[PDB]
Amino acid sequence: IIGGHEVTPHSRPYMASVRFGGQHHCGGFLLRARWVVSAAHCFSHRDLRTGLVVLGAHVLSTAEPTQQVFGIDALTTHPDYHPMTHANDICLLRLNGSAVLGPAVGLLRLPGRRARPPTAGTRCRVAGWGFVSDFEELPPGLMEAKVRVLDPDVCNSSWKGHLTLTMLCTRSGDSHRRGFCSADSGGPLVCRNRAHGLVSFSGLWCGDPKTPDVYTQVSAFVAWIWDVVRRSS
Ligand SMILES: *C[C@@](*)(O)[C@H](CCCNC(=N)N)NC(=O)[C@H](Cc1ccccc1)NC(=O)[C@@H](N)Cc1ccccc1
Ligand SMILES: *[C@@H]1O[C@H](CO[C@@H]2O[C@@H](C)[C@@H](O)[C@@H](O)[C@@H]2O)[C@@H](O)[C@H](O)[C@H]1NC(C)=O
Ligand SMILES: *[C@@H]1O[C@H](CO)[C@@H](O)[C@H](O)[C@H]1NC(C)=O
Ligand SMILES: [Cl-]
């Protein structure tokens, strides 16, 4: 996260760390006790058996008492996620056990099946354990930045016309760079206590207003998410 601040430990209890070979690689959130939403690009060419999902964390390098660690029983990547395109960057992880919900481990709600994406200017927050600079600096624990939804036409022009209808963008509320960076992927953009976005991609410099942060527009995927969950329940 760029231009953010360390959260109070366990104050975002839906946040998940996806780790490969013991190393944090992506974010995600707890949808149901056995289900985590993350970004499809995080799993490309990855041996799933080397993956773990860590819930209840603040400092990932410490074996904290609130941490609950799970293997991935099943990865379901969006059926329309593909190379040579950036859209549909979303997946579900069915965990090999069920989280015990409590003060440090809880669920984040999706937008409603009939909900629209948030209007430009809407205040949201994005959290993660990704880099805090363009020099691959690690955070001391879970970080969060305050951002605002950016007009999709303005975002699309800044991206030289390459955005699709199921993408949404943000900007900083002020003159500082604020947004996500590498290994924040799959974390939610939370607006009004709903997961309206999922961290997907940005430009050469993290948080650069020339290349606005792009999220998967989660409301477009709600029906599919529930289809997958119901399917294996
Ligand atoms: C994976 C997630 O952690 C990461 C967060 C944003 C990183 N932003 C910057 N370093 N500036 N997302 C990516 O790295 C994203 C991967 C991606 C691939 C395919 C479809 C969607 C998303 N890519 C980027 O943000 C771009 N900076 C470069 C890129 C890398 C790999 C493939 C395609 C583009
Ligand atoms: C995004 O915008 C696209 C067009 O982009 C603009 O026109 C091209 C020719 C270039 O000049 C570029 O720099 C401009 O920004 C549309 O084709 C596309 O449909 C738009 N997508 C959405 C979701 O609105
Ligand atoms: C879940 O998976 C992980 C690693 O794949 C493993 O260490 C753990 O024991 C598994 N849990 C159960 C209940 O099988
Ligand atoms: Cl469940």
PDB file of C-alpha atoms and ligand atoms in Angstrom:
ATOM      1  CA  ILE A   1       0.000   0.000   0.000  1.00  0.00           C
ATOM      2  CA  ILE A   2       1.243   3.486  -0.969  1.00  0.00           C
ATOM      3  CA  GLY A   3       0.443   6.554   1.146  1.00  0.00           C
ATOM      4  CA  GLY A   4      -1.346   4.518   3.787  1.00  0.00           C
ATOM      5  CA  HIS A   5      -1.034   3.915   7.496  1.00  0.00           C
ATOM      6  CA  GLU A   6      -0.691   0.889   9.677  1.00  0.00           C
ATOM      7  CA  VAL A   7      -4.101  -0.234  10.919  1.00  0.00           C
ATOM      8  CA  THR A   8      -4.818  -1.111  14.521  1.00  0.00           C
ATOM      9  CA  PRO A   9      -3.975  -4.811  14.708  1.00  0.00           C
ATOM     10  CA  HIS A  10      -6.966  -7.061  13.860  1.00  0.00           C
ATOM     11  CA  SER A  11      -9.223  -4.096  13.044  1.00  0.00           C
ATOM     12  CA  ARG A  12      -9.772  -5.423   9.478  1.00  0.00           C
ATOM     13  CA  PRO A  13     -10.568  -8.999  10.420  1.00  0.00           C
ATOM     14  CA  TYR A  14     -11.680 -10.040   6.903  1.00  0.00           C
ATOM     15  CA  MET A  15      -8.193  -9.519   5.433  1.00  0.00           C
ATOM     16  CA  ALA A  16      -6.343 -12.598   4.208  1.00  0.00           C
ATOM     17  CA  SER A  17      -2.708 -13.138   3.207  1.00  0.00           C
ATOM     18  CA  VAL A  18      -2.020 -15.664   0.455  1.00  0.00           C
ATOM     19  CA  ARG A  19       1.494 -17.014   0.867  1.00  0.00           C
ATOM     20  CA  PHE A  20       3.586 -19.229  -1.392  1.00  0.00           C
ATOM     21  CA  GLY A  21       6.665 -20.991  -0.039  1.00  0.00           C
ATOM     22  CA  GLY A  22       6.111 -19.191   3.278  1.00  0.00           C
ATOM     23  CA  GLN A  23       6.222 -15.738   1.638  1.00  0.00           C
ATOM     24  CA  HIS A  24       3.355 -13.239   1.364  1.00  0.00           C
ATOM     25  CA  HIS A  25       2.318 -12.904  -2.277  1.00  0.00           C
ATOM     26  CA  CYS A  26      -1.220 -11.531  -2.432  1.00  0.00           C
ATOM     27  CA  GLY A  27      -4.181 -10.323  -0.413  1.00  0.00           C
ATOM     28  CA  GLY A  28      -7.758 -11.567  -0.295  1.00  0.00           C
ATOM     29  CA  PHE A  29     -10.792 -11.443   1.934  1.00  0.00           C
ATOM     30  CA  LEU A  30     -12.900 -13.866   3.928  1.00  0.00           C
ATOM     31  CA  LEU A  31     -16.318 -14.185   2.288  1.00  0.00           C
ATOM     32  CA  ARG A  32     -17.565 -17.212   4.262  1.00  0.00           C
ATOM     33  CA  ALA A  33     -15.823 -19.371   6.885  1.00  0.00           C
ATOM     34  CA  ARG A  34     -14.399 -21.666   4.184  1.00  0.00           C
ATOM     35  CA  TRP A  35     -14.170 -19.155   1.284  1.00  0.00           C
ATOM     36  CA  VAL A  36     -11.689 -16.450   0.331  1.00  0.00           C
ATOM     37  CA  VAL A  37     -11.949 -14.086  -2.662  1.00  0.00           C
ATOM     38  CA  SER A  38      -8.645 -13.092  -4.320  1.00  0.00           C
ATOM     39  CA  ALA A  39      -7.190 -12.080  -7.730  1.00  0.00           C
ATOM     40  CA  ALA A  40      -6.741 -14.689 -10.463  1.00  0.00           C
ATOM     41  CA  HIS A  41      -3.350 -13.319 -11.505  1.00  0.00           C
ATOM     42  CA  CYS A  42      -1.951 -14.277  -8.091  1.00  0.00           C
ATOM     43  CA  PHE A  43      -2.160 -18.003  -8.893  1.00  0.00           C
ATOM     44  CA  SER A  44      -0.806 -18.085 -12.435  1.00  0.00           C
ATOM     45  CA  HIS A  45       1.857 -20.819 -12.770  1.00  0.00           C
ATOM     46  CA  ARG A  46       1.663 -21.522  -9.048  1.00  0.00           C
ATOM     47  CA  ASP A  47       1.762 -24.926  -7.424  1.00  0.00           C
ATOM     48  CA  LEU A  48      -1.338 -24.641  -5.176  1.00  0.00           C
ATOM     49  CA  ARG A  49       0.169 -27.146  -2.718  1.00  0.00           C
ATOM     50  CA  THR A  50       2.823 -24.519  -1.851  1.00  0.00           C
ATOM     51  CA  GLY A  51       0.029 -22.045  -0.977  1.00  0.00           C
ATOM     52  CA  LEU A  52      -1.373 -21.119   2.403  1.00  0.00           C
ATOM     53  CA  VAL A  53      -4.058 -18.647   3.398  1.00  0.00           C
ATOM     54  CA  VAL A  54      -3.408 -16.766   6.671  1.00  0.00           C
ATOM     55  CA  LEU A  55      -6.360 -15.213   8.534  1.00  0.00           C
ATOM     56  CA  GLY A  56      -6.259 -13.176  11.751  1.00  0.00           C
ATOM     57  CA  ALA A  57      -2.891 -11.584  10.958  1.00  0.00           C
ATOM     58  CA  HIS A  58      -1.268  -8.222  11.514  1.00  0.00           C
ATOM     59  CA  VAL A  59       2.487  -8.919  11.447  1.00  0.00           C
ATOM     60  CA  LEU A  60       2.873 -11.807   9.012  1.00  0.00           C
ATOM     61  CA  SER A  61       6.415 -12.723  10.071  1.00  0.00           C
ATOM     62  CA  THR A  62       5.260 -13.440  13.645  1.00  0.00           C
ATOM     63  CA  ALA A  63       3.286 -16.493  14.747  1.00  0.00           C
ATOM     64  CA  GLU A  64       0.542 -14.336  16.277  1.00  0.00           C
ATOM     65  CA  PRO A  65      -2.018 -15.995  18.588  1.00  0.00           C
ATOM     66  CA  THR A  66      -4.979 -14.870  16.431  1.00  0.00           C
ATOM     67  CA  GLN A  67      -3.594 -16.349  13.201  1.00  0.00           C
ATOM     68  CA  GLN A  68      -5.502 -19.204  11.554  1.00  0.00           C
ATOM     69  CA  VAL A  69      -3.696 -20.850   8.633  1.00  0.00           C
ATOM     70  CA  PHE A  70      -5.360 -22.987   5.962  1.00  0.00           C
ATOM     71  CA  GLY A  71      -4.493 -24.876   2.828  1.00  0.00           C
ATOM     72  CA  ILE A  72      -6.366 -24.384  -0.424  1.00  0.00           C
ATOM     73  CA  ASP A  73      -8.737 -27.285  -1.190  1.00  0.00           C
ATOM     74  CA  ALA A  74      -9.818 -25.758  -4.526  1.00  0.00           C
ATOM     75  CA  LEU A  75      -9.003 -22.722  -6.645  1.00  0.00           C
ATOM     76  CA  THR A  76     -11.705 -21.519  -9.050  1.00  0.00           C
ATOM     77  CA  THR A  77     -10.478 -18.883 -11.466  1.00  0.00           C
ATOM     78  CA  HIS A  78     -13.089 -16.843 -13.308  1.00  0.00           C
ATOM     79  CA  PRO A  79     -13.927 -18.749 -16.497  1.00  0.00           C
ATOM     80  CA  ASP A  80     -13.231 -15.625 -18.617  1.00  0.00           C
ATOM     81  CA  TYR A  81      -9.835 -14.852 -17.083  1.00  0.00           C
ATOM     82  CA  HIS A  82      -7.261 -15.232 -19.861  1.00  0.00           C
ATOM     83  CA  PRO A  83      -3.799 -14.150 -20.997  1.00  0.00           C
ATOM     84  CA  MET A  84      -3.622 -11.317 -23.580  1.00  0.00           C
ATOM     85  CA  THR A  85      -6.376  -9.607 -21.516  1.00  0.00           C
ATOM     86  CA  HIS A  86      -6.534  -7.989 -18.076  1.00  0.00           C
ATOM     87  CA  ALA A  87     -10.237  -8.370 -17.256  1.00  0.00           C
ATOM     88  CA  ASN A  88     -11.930 -10.845 -14.931  1.00  0.00           C
ATOM     89  CA  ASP A  89      -9.005 -10.850 -12.500  1.00  0.00           C
ATOM     90  CA  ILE A  90     -10.875 -12.691  -9.728  1.00  0.00           C
ATOM     91  CA  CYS A  91     -10.913 -16.146  -8.170  1.00  0.00           C
ATOM     92  CA  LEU A  92     -12.303 -18.089  -5.210  1.00  0.00           C
ATOM     93  CA  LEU A  93     -10.317 -20.183  -2.770  1.00  0.00           C
ATOM     94  CA  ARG A  94     -12.141 -22.995  -0.974  1.00  0.00           C
ATOM     95  CA  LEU A  95     -10.127 -23.564   2.193  1.00  0.00           C
ATOM     96  CA  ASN A  96      -9.339 -27.043   3.591  1.00  0.00           C
ATOM     97  CA  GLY A  97     -11.063 -26.105   6.842  1.00  0.00           C
ATOM     98  CA  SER A  98     -13.448 -23.507   8.242  1.00  0.00           C
ATOM     99  CA  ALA A  99     -12.250 -20.377  10.023  1.00  0.00           C
ATOM    100  CA  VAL A 100     -13.465 -19.935  13.597  1.00  0.00           C
ATOM    101  CA  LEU A 101     -14.953 -16.449  13.498  1.00  0.00           C
ATOM    102  CA  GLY A 102     -14.047 -14.053  16.302  1.00  0.00           C
ATOM    103  CA  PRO A 103     -12.594 -10.622  17.113  1.00  0.00           C
ATOM    104  CA  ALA A 104      -9.696 -11.061  14.666  1.00  0.00           C
ATOM    105  CA  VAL A 105     -11.388 -13.170  11.941  1.00  0.00           C
ATOM    106  CA  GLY A 106     -14.609 -12.099  10.271  1.00  0.00           C
ATOM    107  CA  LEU A 107     -16.484 -11.764   7.019  1.00  0.00           C
ATOM    108  CA  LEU A 108     -16.722  -8.904   4.497  1.00  0.00           C
ATOM    109  CA  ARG A 109     -19.995  -8.453   2.616  1.00  0.00           C
ATOM    110  CA  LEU A 110     -20.255  -8.243  -1.169  1.00  0.00           C
ATOM    111  CA  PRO A 111     -22.308  -5.617  -2.921  1.00  0.00           C
ATOM    112  CA  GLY A 112     -25.925  -6.674  -3.458  1.00  0.00           C
ATOM    113  CA  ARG A 113     -26.961  -8.643  -6.542  1.00  0.00           C
ATOM    114  CA  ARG A 114     -28.752  -5.475  -7.786  1.00  0.00           C
ATOM    115  CA  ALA A 115     -26.146  -2.892  -6.621  1.00  0.00           C
ATOM    116  CA  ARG A 116     -24.363  -0.405  -8.929  1.00  0.00           C
ATOM    117  CA  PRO A 117     -20.660   0.492  -8.703  1.00  0.00           C
ATOM    118  CA  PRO A 118     -19.931   3.436  -6.369  1.00  0.00           C
ATOM    119  CA  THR A 119     -20.192   6.984  -7.749  1.00  0.00           C
ATOM    120  CA  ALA A 120     -17.089   9.074  -8.492  1.00  0.00           C
ATOM    121  CA  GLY A 121     -15.753  10.701  -5.317  1.00  0.00           C
ATOM    122  CA  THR A 122     -17.016   7.942  -3.005  1.00  0.00           C
ATOM    123  CA  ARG A 123     -14.620   7.504  -0.080  1.00  0.00           C
ATOM    124  CA  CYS A 124     -13.198   3.988   0.184  1.00  0.00           C
ATOM    125  CA  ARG A 125     -10.271   2.186   1.794  1.00  0.00           C
ATOM    126  CA  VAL A 126      -7.804  -0.417   0.541  1.00  0.00           C
ATOM    127  CA  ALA A 127      -5.652  -2.557   2.812  1.00  0.00           C
ATOM    128  CA  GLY A 128      -2.776  -4.947   2.301  1.00  0.00           C
ATOM    129  CA  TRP A 129       0.734  -6.173   3.041  1.00  0.00           C
ATOM    130  CA  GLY A 130       2.162  -5.159  -0.341  1.00  0.00           C
ATOM    131  CA  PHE A 131       5.096  -2.852  -0.862  1.00  0.00           C
ATOM    132  CA  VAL A 132       4.985   0.672   0.567  1.00  0.00           C
ATOM    133  CA  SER A 133       7.255   2.250  -2.073  1.00  0.00           C
ATOM    134  CA  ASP A 134       8.637   1.637  -5.538  1.00  0.00           C
ATOM    135  CA  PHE A 135      11.759   0.164  -3.877  1.00  0.00           C
ATOM    136  CA  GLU A 136      10.108  -3.016  -2.712  1.00  0.00           C
ATOM    137  CA  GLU A 137       9.931  -1.903   0.924  1.00  0.00           C
ATOM    138  CA  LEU A 138       7.823  -4.138   3.161  1.00  0.00           C
ATOM    139  CA  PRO A 139       5.310  -2.762   5.659  1.00  0.00           C
ATOM    140  CA  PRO A 140       5.638  -3.403   9.409  1.00  0.00           C
ATOM    141  CA  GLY A 141       2.117  -4.925   9.394  1.00  0.00           C
ATOM    142  CA  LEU A 142      -1.245  -4.526   7.662  1.00  0.00           C
ATOM    143  CA  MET A 143      -1.528  -1.096   6.026  1.00  0.00           C
ATOM    144  CA  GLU A 144      -4.515   0.813   4.686  1.00  0.00           C
ATOM    145  CA  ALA A 145      -4.888   3.824   2.393  1.00  0.00           C
ATOM    146  CA  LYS A 146      -7.815   6.200   1.971  1.00  0.00           C
ATOM    147  CA  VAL A 147      -8.798   6.693  -1.687  1.00  0.00           C
ATOM    148  CA  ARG A 148     -11.761   7.944  -3.724  1.00  0.00           C
ATOM    149  CA  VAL A 149     -13.506   6.382  -6.713  1.00  0.00           C
ATOM    150  CA  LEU A 150     -12.312   8.038  -9.958  1.00  0.00           C
ATOM    151  CA  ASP A 151     -14.670   8.874 -12.851  1.00  0.00           C
ATOM    152  CA  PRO A 152     -14.462   5.796 -15.140  1.00  0.00           C
ATOM    153  CA  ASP A 153     -14.170   7.981 -18.274  1.00  0.00           C
ATOM    154  CA  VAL A 154     -11.279   9.969 -16.796  1.00  0.00           C
ATOM    155  CA  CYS A 155      -9.634   6.696 -15.747  1.00  0.00           C
ATOM    156  CA  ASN A 156     -10.154   5.155 -19.158  1.00  0.00           C
ATOM    157  CA  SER A 157      -8.556   8.157 -20.924  1.00  0.00           C
ATOM    158  CA  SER A 158      -5.527   8.017 -18.552  1.00  0.00           C
ATOM    159  CA  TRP A 159      -5.248   4.324 -19.500  1.00  0.00           C
ATOM    160  CA  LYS A 160      -5.271   5.313 -23.183  1.00  0.00           C
ATOM    161  CA  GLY A 161      -8.629   3.590 -23.777  1.00  0.00           C
ATOM    162  CA  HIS A 162      -7.801   0.110 -22.458  1.00  0.00           C
ATOM    163  CA  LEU A 163     -10.331  -0.182 -19.598  1.00  0.00           C
ATOM    164  CA  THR A 164     -13.405  -2.414 -19.688  1.00  0.00           C
ATOM    165  CA  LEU A 165     -16.854  -2.010 -18.104  1.00  0.00           C
ATOM    166  CA  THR A 166     -16.015  -4.354 -15.199  1.00  0.00           C
ATOM    167  CA  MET A 167     -13.068  -2.262 -13.991  1.00  0.00           C
ATOM    168  CA  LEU A 168     -13.153   0.587 -11.540  1.00  0.00           C
ATOM    169  CA  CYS A 169     -10.544   3.087 -10.556  1.00  0.00           C
ATOM    170  CA  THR A 170      -9.411   5.245  -7.707  1.00  0.00           C
ATOM    171  CA  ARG A 171      -7.449   8.385  -6.979  1.00  0.00           C
ATOM    172  CA  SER A 172      -5.992   9.997  -3.863  1.00  0.00           C
ATOM    173  CA  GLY A 173      -8.125  12.510  -1.972  1.00  0.00           C
ATOM    174  CA  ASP A 174      -5.168  14.925  -1.995  1.00  0.00           C
ATOM    175  CA  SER A 175      -1.803  15.667  -3.685  1.00  0.00           C
ATOM    176  CA  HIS A 176      -0.034  12.591  -2.236  1.00  0.00           C
ATOM    177  CA  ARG A 177       0.182   9.257  -4.022  1.00  0.00           C
ATOM    178  CA  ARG A 178      -2.232   6.877  -2.339  1.00  0.00           C
ATOM    179  CA  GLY A 179      -3.200   3.413  -3.513  1.00  0.00           C
ATOM    180  CA  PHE A 180      -1.941  -0.136  -3.838  1.00  0.00           C
ATOM    181  CA  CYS A 181       1.314  -1.789  -4.928  1.00  0.00           C
ATOM    182  CA  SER A 182       2.733  -5.259  -5.644  1.00  0.00           C
ATOM    183  CA  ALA A 183       1.347  -8.005  -3.397  1.00  0.00           C
ATOM    184  CA  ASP A 184      -1.763  -6.000  -2.534  1.00  0.00           C
ATOM    185  CA  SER A 185      -3.603  -7.849  -5.330  1.00  0.00           C
ATOM    186  CA  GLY A 186      -6.799  -9.574  -4.381  1.00  0.00           C
ATOM    187  CA  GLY A 187      -7.495  -7.292  -1.419  1.00  0.00           C
ATOM    188  CA  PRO A 188     -10.839  -5.510  -1.349  1.00  0.00           C
ATOM    189  CA  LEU A 189     -11.638  -1.888  -1.980  1.00  0.00           C
ATOM    190  CA  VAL A 190     -14.116  -1.335   0.852  1.00  0.00           C
ATOM    191  CA  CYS A 191     -16.739   1.404   0.398  1.00  0.00           C
ATOM    192  CA  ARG A 192     -19.631   1.679   2.868  1.00  0.00           C
ATOM    193  CA  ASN A 193     -18.604  -1.679   4.420  1.00  0.00           C
ATOM    194  CA  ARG A 194     -18.925  -3.553   1.120  1.00  0.00           C
ATOM    195  CA  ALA A 195     -16.247  -5.092  -1.153  1.00  0.00           C
ATOM    196  CA  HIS A 196     -16.814  -2.919  -4.249  1.00  0.00           C
ATOM    197  CA  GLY A 197     -13.397  -3.523  -5.781  1.00  0.00           C
ATOM    198  CA  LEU A 198     -10.595  -6.059  -5.847  1.00  0.00           C
ATOM    199  CA  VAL A 199      -7.010  -4.888  -6.340  1.00  0.00           C
ATOM    200  CA  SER A 200      -5.928  -5.859  -9.895  1.00  0.00           C
ATOM    201  CA  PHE A 201      -3.340  -3.708 -11.692  1.00  0.00           C
ATOM    202  CA  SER A 202      -1.668  -0.342 -12.052  1.00  0.00           C
ATOM    203  CA  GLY A 203       1.196   1.381 -13.920  1.00  0.00           C
ATOM    204  CA  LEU A 204       4.975   1.554 -13.745  1.00  0.00           C
ATOM    205  CA  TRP A 205       4.994   3.588 -10.511  1.00  0.00           C
ATOM    206  CA  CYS A 206       2.712   2.547  -7.658  1.00  0.00           C
ATOM    207  CA  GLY A 207      -0.050   5.081  -6.943  1.00  0.00           C
ATOM    208  CA  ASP A 208       0.928   7.291  -9.898  1.00  0.00           C
ATOM    209  CA  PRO A 209      -2.080   9.439 -10.836  1.00  0.00           C
ATOM    210  CA  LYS A 210      -1.021   9.123 -14.496  1.00  0.00           C
ATOM    211  CA  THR A 211      -1.868   5.411 -14.262  1.00  0.00           C
ATOM    212  CA  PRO A 212      -4.830   5.196 -11.846  1.00  0.00           C
ATOM    213  CA  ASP A 213      -5.221   2.094  -9.706  1.00  0.00           C
ATOM    214  CA  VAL A 214      -7.524  -0.395 -11.377  1.00  0.00           C
ATOM    215  CA  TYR A 215      -9.793  -2.764  -9.467  1.00  0.00           C
ATOM    216  CA  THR A 216     -12.073  -5.563 -10.520  1.00  0.00           C
ATOM    217  CA  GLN A 217     -15.594  -4.144 -10.235  1.00  0.00           C
ATOM    218  CA  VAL A 218     -16.928  -6.743  -7.803  1.00  0.00           C
ATOM    219  CA  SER A 219     -20.663  -6.116  -8.304  1.00  0.00           C
ATOM    220  CA  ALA A 220     -20.357  -7.524 -11.866  1.00  0.00           C
ATOM    221  CA  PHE A 221     -19.078 -10.809 -10.412  1.00  0.00           C
ATOM    222  CA  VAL A 222     -21.434 -11.316  -7.438  1.00  0.00           C
ATOM    223  CA  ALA A 223     -23.704 -13.765  -9.278  1.00  0.00           C
ATOM    224  CA  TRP A 224     -20.739 -15.869 -10.361  1.00  0.00           C
ATOM    225  CA  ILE A 225     -19.162 -15.814  -6.872  1.00  0.00           C
ATOM    226  CA  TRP A 226     -22.336 -17.213  -5.306  1.00  0.00           C
ATOM    227  CA  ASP A 227     -22.765 -19.768  -8.067  1.00  0.00           C
ATOM    228  CA  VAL A 228     -19.297 -21.150  -7.293  1.00  0.00           C
ATOM    229  CA  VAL A 229     -19.878 -21.163  -3.532  1.00  0.00           C
ATOM    230  CA  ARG A 230     -23.336 -22.808  -3.784  1.00  0.00           C
ATOM    231  CA  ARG A 231     -21.899 -25.366  -6.253  1.00  0.00           C
ATOM    232  CA  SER A 232     -19.477 -26.753  -3.654  1.00  0.00           C
ATOM    233  CA  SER A 233     -21.742 -26.435  -0.576  1.00  0.00           C
TER     234      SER A 233
HETATM  235  C1  LIG B   1      -0.684  -9.135  -8.433  1.00  0.00           C
HETATM  236  C2  LIG B   1      -0.971  -7.862  -7.603  1.00  0.00           C
HETATM  237  O1  LIG B   1      -0.202  -7.983  -6.430  1.00  0.00           O
HETATM  238  C3  LIG B   1      -0.391  -6.668  -8.390  1.00  0.00           C
HETATM  239  C4  LIG B   1      -0.807  -5.351  -7.679  1.00  0.00           C
HETATM  240  C5  LIG B   1      -0.469  -4.087  -8.476  1.00  0.00           C
HETATM  241  C6  LIG B   1       1.028  -3.950  -8.774  1.00  0.00           C
HETATM  242  N1  LIG B   1       1.239  -2.612  -9.346  1.00  0.00           N
HETATM  243  C7  LIG B   1       2.487  -2.151  -9.673  1.00  0.00           C
HETATM  244  N2  LIG B   1       3.579  -2.910  -9.362  1.00  0.00           N
HETATM  245  N3  LIG B   1       2.651  -0.990 -10.271  1.00  0.00           N
HETATM  246  N4  LIG B   1      -0.889  -6.677  -9.774  1.00  0.00           N
HETATM  247  C8  LIG B   1      -0.072  -6.837 -10.850  1.00  0.00           C
HETATM  248  O2  LIG B   1       1.127  -6.985 -10.691  1.00  0.00           O
HETATM  249  C9  LIG B   1      -0.725  -6.834 -12.208  1.00  0.00           C
HETATM  250  C10 LIG B   1      -0.824  -8.290 -12.629  1.00  0.00           C
HETATM  251  C11 LIG B   1      -1.964  -8.592 -13.585  1.00  0.00           C
HETATM  252  C12 LIG B   1      -1.746  -9.506 -14.619  1.00  0.00           C
HETATM  253  C13 LIG B   1      -2.758  -9.848 -15.508  1.00  0.00           C
HETATM  254  C14 LIG B   1      -4.015  -9.270 -15.383  1.00  0.00           C
HETATM  255  C15 LIG B   1      -4.255  -8.364 -14.357  1.00  0.00           C
HETATM  256  C16 LIG B   1      -3.241  -8.037 -13.470  1.00  0.00           C
HETATM  257  N5  LIG B   1       0.097  -6.101 -13.181  1.00  0.00           N
HETATM  258  C17 LIG B   1       0.371  -4.804 -13.044  1.00  0.00           C
HETATM  259  O3  LIG B   1      -0.069  -4.126 -12.097  1.00  0.00           O
HETATM  260  C18 LIG B   1       1.241  -4.117 -14.064  1.00  0.00           C
HETATM  261  N6  LIG B   1       2.139  -3.225 -13.332  1.00  0.00           N
HETATM  262  C19 LIG B   1       2.185  -5.021 -14.875  1.00  0.00           C
HETATM  263  C20 LIG B   1       1.824  -6.432 -15.299  1.00  0.00           C
HETATM  264  C21 LIG B   1       2.448  -7.513 -14.675  1.00  0.00           C
HETATM  265  C22 LIG B   1       2.154  -8.814 -15.053  1.00  0.00           C
HETATM  266  C23 LIG B   1       1.247  -9.038 -16.081  1.00  0.00           C
HETATM  267  C24 LIG B   1       0.633  -7.965 -16.720  1.00  0.00           C
HETATM  268  C25 LIG B   1       0.925  -6.662 -16.337  1.00  0.00           C
HETATM  269  C1  LIG B   2     -12.310   3.442 -23.175  1.00  0.00           C
HETATM  270  O1  LIG B   2     -11.940   4.400 -24.164  1.00  0.00           O
HETATM  271  C2  LIG B   2     -11.717   3.851 -25.453  1.00  0.00           C
HETATM  272  C3  LIG B   2     -11.198   4.939 -26.412  1.00  0.00           C
HETATM  273  O2  LIG B   2     -10.034   5.587 -25.896  1.00  0.00           O
HETATM  274  C4  LIG B   2      -9.799   6.860 -26.536  1.00  0.00           C
HETATM  275  O3  LIG B   2      -9.754   6.742 -27.950  1.00  0.00           O
HETATM  276  C5  LIG B   2      -8.622   6.083 -28.498  1.00  0.00           C
HETATM  277  C6  LIG B   2      -8.759   6.070 -30.018  1.00  0.00           C
HETATM  278  C7  LIG B   2      -7.328   6.768 -28.060  1.00  0.00           C
HETATM  279  O4  LIG B   2      -7.246   8.077 -28.593  1.00  0.00           O
HETATM  280  C8  LIG B   2      -7.273   6.845 -26.538  1.00  0.00           C
HETATM  281  O5  LIG B   2      -6.101   7.527 -26.123  1.00  0.00           O
HETATM  282  C9  LIG B   2      -8.527   7.551 -26.012  1.00  0.00           C
HETATM  283  O6  LIG B   2      -8.475   7.624 -24.599  1.00  0.00           O
HETATM  284  C10 LIG B   2     -13.017   3.180 -25.918  1.00  0.00           C
HETATM  285  O7  LIG B   2     -12.800   2.518 -27.140  1.00  0.00           O
HETATM  286  C11 LIG B   2     -13.529   2.162 -24.890  1.00  0.00           C
HETATM  287  O8  LIG B   2     -14.783   1.633 -25.258  1.00  0.00           O
HETATM  288  C12 LIG B   2     -13.645   2.795 -23.508  1.00  0.00           C
HETATM  289  N1  LIG B   2     -14.028   1.813 -22.496  1.00  0.00           N
HETATM  290  C13 LIG B   2     -14.925   2.048 -21.529  1.00  0.00           C
HETATM  291  C14 LIG B   2     -15.207   0.929 -20.565  1.00  0.00           C
HETATM  292  O9  LIG B   2     -15.521   3.121 -21.387  1.00  0.00           O
HETATM  293  C1  LIG B   3      -4.643 -28.027   5.138  1.00  0.00           C
HETATM  294  O1  LIG B   3      -3.583 -27.904   4.195  1.00  0.00           O
HETATM  295  C2  LIG B   3      -2.289 -27.619   4.713  1.00  0.00           C
HETATM  296  C3  LIG B   3      -1.230 -27.543   3.600  1.00  0.00           C
HETATM  297  O2  LIG B   3      -1.688 -27.954   2.326  1.00  0.00           O
HETATM  298  C4  LIG B   3      -1.904 -28.678   5.755  1.00  0.00           C
HETATM  299  O3  LIG B   3      -0.702 -28.309   6.400  1.00  0.00           O
HETATM  300  C5  LIG B   3      -3.011 -28.876   6.794  1.00  0.00           C
HETATM  301  O4  LIG B   3      -2.684 -29.904   7.711  1.00  0.00           O
HETATM  302  C6  LIG B   3      -4.334 -29.179   6.094  1.00  0.00           C
HETATM  303  N1  LIG B   3      -5.410 -29.355   7.063  1.00  0.00           N
HETATM  304  C7  LIG B   3      -6.155 -30.465   7.162  1.00  0.00           C
HETATM  305  C8  LIG B   3      -7.223 -30.472   8.221  1.00  0.00           C
HETATM  306  O5  LIG B   3      -6.008 -31.459   6.447  1.00  0.00           O
HETATM  307 CL    CL B   4     -18.432 -21.594   4.810  1.00  0.00          CL
END
